[PDB]
Design an enzyme around this catalytic site. Structure first.
Site, PDB file in Angstrom:
ATOM      1  N   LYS A  66     117.083  70.745  17.626  1.00 15.58           N
ATOM      2  CA  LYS A  66     117.835  69.978  18.617  1.00 15.58           C
ATOM      3  C   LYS A  66     117.432  70.407  20.028  1.00 15.58           C
ATOM      4  CE  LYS A  66     121.710  71.463  16.870  1.00 15.58           C
ATOM      5  NZ  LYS A  66     121.362  72.220  18.101  1.00 15.58           N
ATOM      6  N   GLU A  97     122.778  74.836  25.696  1.00 11.10           N
ATOM      7  CA  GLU A  97     123.602  75.711  24.859  1.00 11.10           C
ATOM      8  C   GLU A  97     124.085  76.827  25.780  1.00 11.10           C
ATOM      9  OE1 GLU A  97     121.363  78.413  21.874  1.00 11.10           O
ATOM     10  OE2 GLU A  97     122.705  77.129  20.680  1.00 11.10           O
ATOM     11  N   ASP A 131     123.863  69.658  24.793  1.00  4.02           N
ATOM     12  CA  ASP A 131     123.499  70.392  23.583  1.00  4.02           C
ATOM     13  C   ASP A 131     124.865  70.608  22.893  1.00  4.02           C
ATOM     14  OD1 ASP A 131     122.883  72.521  21.626  1.00  4.02           O
ATOM     15  OD2 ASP A 131     121.050  72.847  22.774  1.00  4.02           O
ATOM     16  N   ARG A 132     125.228  69.693  22.023  1.00  6.47           N
ATOM     17  CA  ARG A 132     126.444  69.709  21.267  1.00  6.47           C
ATOM     18  C   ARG A 132     127.621  69.061  21.985  1.00  6.47           C
ATOM     19  NH1 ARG A 132     125.765  71.874  16.457  1.00  6.47           N
ATOM     20  NH2 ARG A 132     124.628  73.640  15.974  1.00  6.47           N
ATOM     21  N   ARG A 138     113.973  79.957  13.779  1.00  6.03           N
ATOM     22  CA  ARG A 138     114.782  79.918  15.007  1.00  6.03           C
ATOM     23  C   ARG A 138     116.160  80.534  14.808  1.00  6.03           C
ATOM     24  NH1 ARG A 138     113.122  73.927  16.311  1.00  6.03           N
ATOM     25  NH2 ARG A 138     111.460  75.083  15.228  1.00  6.03           N
ATOM     26  N   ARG A 186     119.042  82.827  15.939  1.00 10.47           N
ATOM     27  CA  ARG A 186     119.603  83.282  17.217  1.00 10.47           C
ATOM     28  C   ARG A 186     119.995  84.739  17.205  1.00 10.47           C
ATOM     29  NH1 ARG A 186     119.248  77.455  17.580  1.00 10.47           N
ATOM     30  NH2 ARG A 186     119.838  76.670  19.641  1.00 10.47           N
ATOM     31  N   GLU A 204     122.230  86.276  14.516  1.00 12.91           N
ATOM     32  CA  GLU A 204     122.332  85.391  13.361  1.00 12.91           C
ATOM     33  C   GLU A 204     121.714  85.986  12.109  1.00 12.91           C
ATOM     34  OE1 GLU A 204     121.145  81.478  14.354  1.00 12.91           O
ATOM     35  OE2 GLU A 204     121.062  80.756  12.277  1.00 12.91           O
TER      36      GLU A 204
HETATM   37  C1  LIG Z   1     128.781  75.494  18.407  1.00 10.91           C
HETATM   38  C2  LIG Z   1     128.934  76.617  17.386  1.00 10.91           C
HETATM   39  C3  LIG Z   1     127.829  77.299  17.077  1.00 10.91           C
HETATM   40  N1  LIG Z   1     127.826  78.339  16.180  1.00 10.91           N
HETATM   41  C4  LIG Z   1     126.568  79.022  15.811  1.00 10.91           C
HETATM   42  C5  LIG Z   1     125.579  78.382  14.902  1.00 10.91           C
HETATM   43  C6  LIG Z   1     124.230  78.953  15.316  1.00 10.91           C
HETATM   44  O1  LIG Z   1     124.307  80.323  15.079  1.00 10.91           O
HETATM   45  C7  LIG Z   1     124.289  78.843  16.824  1.00 10.91           C
HETATM   46  C8  LIG Z   1     123.979  77.432  17.271  1.00 10.91           C
HETATM   47  O2  LIG Z   1     122.870  77.360  18.219  1.00 10.91           O
HETATM   48  O3  LIG Z   1     125.668  79.211  16.952  1.00 10.91           O
HETATM   49  C9  LIG Z   1     128.976  78.692  15.569  1.00 10.91           C
HETATM   50  O4  LIG Z   1     129.067  79.616  14.738  1.00 10.91           O
HETATM   51  N2  LIG Z   1     130.135  77.963  15.910  1.00 10.91           N
HETATM   52  C10 LIG Z   1     130.178  76.889  16.827  1.00 10.91           C
HETATM   53  O5  LIG Z   1     131.270  76.292  17.063  1.00 10.91           O
END
Ligand SMILES: Cc1cn([C@H]2C[C@H](O)[C@@H](CO)O2)c(=O)[nH]c1=O
Ligand SMILES: Cc1cn([C@H]2C[C@H](O)[C@@H](CO)O2)c(=O)[nH]c1=O
Lengths: 314, 306
Positions: free
Chosen positions: B17, B33, B109-110, B167, B169, B172
């Site tokens: 995205k 983001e 972005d969202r 990708r 984060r 993550e």
């Molecule tokens: C927007 C959002 C993203 N995220 C996480 C998903 C991915 O790790 C990253 C999205 O770019 O953040 C959440 O856990 N909760 C949310 O509400």
């Protein structure tokens, strides 16, 4: 189209808001005044198990040094979602039926609510931030989620000497929490008034620098240090330049937008239940009524209120 | 009055995205983001805490209750920037323009519903959040303004897993269960709008979950058949039924578009740009609304998107 009078009774817990409100409902014709009560059953069962206990236990644990500030904040933030749920769901389904502001003849229907969305989306959180059990970021997160203020948002806050309040409250015993919640609502009253007199937080922000040293629809304009704005001068929200990060600044912009059009009234709770009742009933005269959107909005609103009351208020 | 085109790029994480919006000076701004808010401003490394708690839960190191508190609390931080942005931007949105180029194009972005519905729903499917918390977030979804165009992504699961791997984060953890859950939630979301637009009435079809649009079992409504939300006789409590009514209202007027992400970054970019032709534009409310929107966007980007 019929007219509607929405009145939200709010303020610190333990002042007699519930007793008073029911005395008010008792006097009206069976069907021309409905009461949306405290959703106790949602807080104790439906939304989660004994939410009020968990709140008080956590504040007590924190105080004792048994858990950290971070641990307490997560719990408090999470619990506050449960506490505010019923107010927010009710506001969202009710909104569509509210039309424009009619004026201060009797209203076809009168909705008496036990608290307004801002109790859980602004007031309790801010108080918990003052108790050290919530982050200022979470508080503003709740503030940004406050629903748009509809026309005819009449809110009644309560007045009561602290000793009388402590007395009335005392039958966990948290006096710091009582002080906190008391200051938050004082600030809130001052904030509406500040906002209605032309106060611009962005313009007066510079006047804050200091520490901690009430009317809502009467008096002169309060100094920003006496409004909710002072609370957000927390180091967590400040940038290297010394100014607020824009995220938080925008949240304060939302706070002002939401509070400037609200109609706030002070009810003196230092009197007998019947006095309070007759007291509250006399204030209804200057509250703003609104038209409903559909002809069948009255009955729908009645159903909603009764259903809410039956399912959640005991 | 100038016309504005708001476009919310949303869907599961790891499809591309961000790359696509990056690739796609003054007639188009990008609200990115808010990573800096998630990692520093709102709290310390929020993405890490989310993934660590899901991992801890999975290992049996903490309880389902413990996980939900943390997860609920963190979701407040994750959605904060979208909610604050929606609240200050709303006032400037006027009615619809029509089915000529727009004076300004806002690419986000969202959308608020990622944090107020989709992520929470997915965590509920993961066992790390209560269905009551999910509906609490749903109930707070901002009123749907006109011209709410949202683009969701299409991507085969193998291609998605493949792409997600690279990708990752900050904080993550590569969680395939979470990937499936989020993929299901968005699939359902797409079906739900469509269900709603075709006349679907959840109260009328609720019985089909316990007995020319999608079947209710293929919409988000199926998720709320959770025993926690039902009374002893099986009925959904009204508090929750009202939350579902808010959900239908919010999603029915939304404009959803599917972008195929199984192609090169430029393919996606052009792909996305060709989709803008059918999106709904709106008028702004003040003559000086464009510049204010531009400032907002740029400031958000500078302060929170890196
Ligand atoms: C927007 C959002 C993203 N995220 C996480 C998903 C991915 O790790 C990253 C999205 O770019 O953040 C959440 O856990 N909760 C949310 O509400
Ligand atoms: C409305 C509300 C009340 N409370 C507290 C005050 C009293 O202790 C009890 C009764 O409202 O609940 C909260 O902690 N949070 C809230 O959002």
């Amino acid at each position: 189209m019929p007219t509607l009078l929405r009145v939200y009774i709010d303020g610190p817990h333990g002042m007699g808001k519930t007793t008073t409100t029911q005395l008010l409902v008792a006097l009206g014709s069976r069907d021309d005044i409905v009461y949306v009560p405290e959703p106790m059953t949602y807080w104790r069962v439906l939304g989660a198990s004994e939410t009020i206990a968990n709140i008080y236990t956590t504040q007590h644990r924190l105080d004792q040094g048994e858990i950290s500030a971070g641990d307490a904040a997560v719990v408090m933030t999470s619990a506050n979602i449960t506490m505010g749920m019923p107010y927010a769901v009710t506001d969202a389904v009710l909104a569509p039926h509210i039309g424009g502001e009619a004026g201060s003849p009797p209203p076809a229907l009168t909705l008496i609510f036990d608290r307004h969305p801002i109790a859980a989306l602004l007031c309790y959180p801010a108080a918990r931030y003052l108790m050290g059990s919530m982050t200022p970021q979470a508080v503003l997160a709740f503030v940004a989620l406050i629903p748009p203020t509809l026309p005819g948002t009449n809110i009644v806050l309560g007045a009561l000497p602290e000793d009388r309040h402590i007395d009335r409250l005392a039958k966990r015993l948290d006096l710091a929490m009582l002080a906190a919640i008391r200051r938050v609502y004082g600030l809130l009253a001052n904030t509406v008034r500040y906002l209605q007199c032309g106060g611009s937080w962005r313009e007066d922000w510079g006047q804050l620098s200091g520490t901690a040293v009430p009317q809502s629809n009467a008096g002169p304009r309060p100094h920003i240090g006496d409004t909710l704005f002072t609370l957000f001068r927390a180091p967590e929200l400040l940038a290297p330049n010394g100014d607020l990060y824009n995220v938080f600044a925008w949240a304060l912009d939302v706070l002002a937008k939401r509070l400037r059009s609200m109609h706030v009234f002070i009810l003196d709770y230092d009197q007998s239940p019947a006095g309070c009742r007759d007291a509250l009933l006399q204030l209804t005269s200057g509250m703003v009524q609104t038209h409903v959107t559909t002809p069948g909005s009255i009955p729908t609103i009645c159903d909603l209120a009764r259903t809410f009351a039956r399912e959640m208020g005991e």
